[PDB]
Write a protein that binds this ligand. Structure first.
Ligand SMILES: CCCC[C@@H](CN[C@@H](CCCC)C(=O)N[C@@H](CCC(N)=O)C(=O)N[C@@H](CCCNC(N)=[NH2+])C(N)=O)NC(=O)[C@@H](NC(=O)[C@@H](NC(C)=O)[C@@H](C)O)[C@@H](C)CC
Lengths: 99, 99
């Protein structure tokens, strides 16, 4: 779909079998999801944002549906203000910025 | 134009008489530009995201050109690591997310 930006680009995602709401974020390199239980092994990683750096759990090759679109990639789980779908998965669903 | 997301969606912007590279951020409500001595009346603001918050100066009705596209709106100036074009301006240049 074509999504305008008058409202936050929020969509329903399905991860670990659980439905969640996430923000399609072109300004995010990666996909960061709020702390949750996720099946699989993970490795400690640190990411940055506008206010600084936070520690997250890096889960690789995670199956995730984004607005009805399937993606299999890295999902960082940690204390993010918002669940955000980053470029690693946006590219997987063929998302582009247009104007 | 159409911007793919393999790489950070960075574009040239013009603000306060200066040219800069800015990140088109669909996950940002507002526009945050790197610290610069912009003239005019402003109001203190605190904005956050991953890592926490940063103090910025809110300037209203600031003219900014985004990849050749003119827009006029609120620009927050402060210690941001990257120049961020948020939805307040992305909507003005007619930017959409498509997949
Ligand atoms: C989490 C909050 C929602 C998404 C977030 C994404 N912001 C981009 C801004 C770019 C950095 C300043 C970001 O954090 N991107 C991260 C996302 C995390 C990630 N890992 O992808 C990123 O790409 N980080 C890279 C940093 C690369 C730095 N570049 C470099 N080293 N060369 C990274 N891999 O750690 N939005 C925001 O940060 C904006 N906040 C908001 O829109 C709202 N605030 C809150 C708390 O939700 C609103 C209520 O203010 C800021 C700019 C104020 C308008």
């Amino acid at each position: 779909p074509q999504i305008t930006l008058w409202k936050r680009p929020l969509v329903t995602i399905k991860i670990g079998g659980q439905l969640k709401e996430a923000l399609l974020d072109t300004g995010a390199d990666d996909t960061v999801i709020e702390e949750m239980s996720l099946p699989g092994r993970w490795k400690p990683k640190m990411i940055g944002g506008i206010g600084g750096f936070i520690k997250v759990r890096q889960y690789d090759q995670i199956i995730i549906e984004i607005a009805g679109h399937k993606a299999i990639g890295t999902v960082l789980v940690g204390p993010t203000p918002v669940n955000i779908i980053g470029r690693n998965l946006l590219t997987q669903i063929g998302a582009t910025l247009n104007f």
